[PDB]
Amino acid sequence: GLFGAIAGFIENGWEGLIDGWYGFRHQNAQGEGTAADYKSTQSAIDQITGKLNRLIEKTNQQFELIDNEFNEVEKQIGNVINWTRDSITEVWSYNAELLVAMENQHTIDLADSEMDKLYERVKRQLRENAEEDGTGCFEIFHKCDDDCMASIRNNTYDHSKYREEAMQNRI
């Protein structure tokens, strides 16, 4: 993707993440945990869903018969009709192919974007209390128990509360 997270510095996805599109996996002395992030998941779902509803918008155009399946029309006008119909069919086959390909490129890139946005949100939450390891994880330079992890996940983590300890541990 254009943002190099989903197929990039995040090496693969989590098949156990069944509760959302994006999420957090934490590690501390109390153990390991995995939870889904609602805001990013719903953001991506909302954009792809809006795209889908956009693509199935119905427009009422009626076309009638100009050919004859039982008694073939005159040769010259029949060849003109056949040429026109085949040209239009080619135009719409091209439009469908291009439309689906472009939409797919953009969908993949948009999901990549939402992943990167979640990662950056957490990075700005942690401020000077953590460092990126380069695989999508933040090494936290202070003890972060389950309540601390939960405060990161629901955006109530106060970096000042741990700053002096973490800064000292980074030097």
Partner: protein, 316 residues
Amino acid sequence: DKICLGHHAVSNGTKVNTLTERGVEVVNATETVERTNIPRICSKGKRTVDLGQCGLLGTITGPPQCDQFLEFSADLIIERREGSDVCYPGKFVNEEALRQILRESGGIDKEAMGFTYSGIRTNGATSACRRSGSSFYAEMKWLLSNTDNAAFPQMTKSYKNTRKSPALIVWGIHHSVSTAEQTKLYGSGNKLVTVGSSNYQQSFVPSPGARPQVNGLSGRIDFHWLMLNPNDTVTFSFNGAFIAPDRASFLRGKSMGIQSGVQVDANCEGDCYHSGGTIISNLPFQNIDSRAVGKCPRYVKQRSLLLATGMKNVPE
């Protein structure tokens, strides 16, 4: 202590195509091309007429197989391969234009044209148009001389369309098997039919001569037609070989016509038809029939085009 960001995945994703790549796996995808056909004409909510053995053009002239449709009314018109416009051998001139007019007419409403005759027969009949005996087109009259080889009087018949929509006017030319038969029926000499309105003028001459027997008969009756505007008048000038109209037709409203070979189902409802059935779908494209009509998904040549609905699938 650490916290890691990640995304979901599945073991087996769905392959789709993008601008740069074919067969990239994504977590989820959905089809845009419709392939499922319902092999019936779903007609709920639509006044539907299955013409069967009646050819659509016959509804104007009225051979026996069309007796039940002489003033039909419909939202959907179904033509069948066994439909015939004629009973006595012949054909319409400019038939496809008239079929296209009648497919969207909503049906026809007949009105007497008021032609009366004297000095001729009006009861021409044939064993090709059987209604409990030798008969003829219910909407036409085969004008003949009073007796064999008698002279057919020169005649002029006019009809004025007093209604607010154009009137469909039809007449016929009889082509005898020989000059002797044409003389027996209408008297000797050249035969001429002139037809005129304010925007129409055309002449017709019969073409007597030997031709193969169709259903045992070698004569023909070819039908011609015009649309007569309001306040406009049609005038026929003729001295024989003329199949006169008894009634004119007016279009009822709107409809659509299809050609099908599958049965009607008054218990499913649809809006997109082809000869093989009905296309019922919310998908924007279809790969079933490029000649479908109605309100249809756009036909494409691809059988499948998967649209991604999830992120790229990166399993472990």
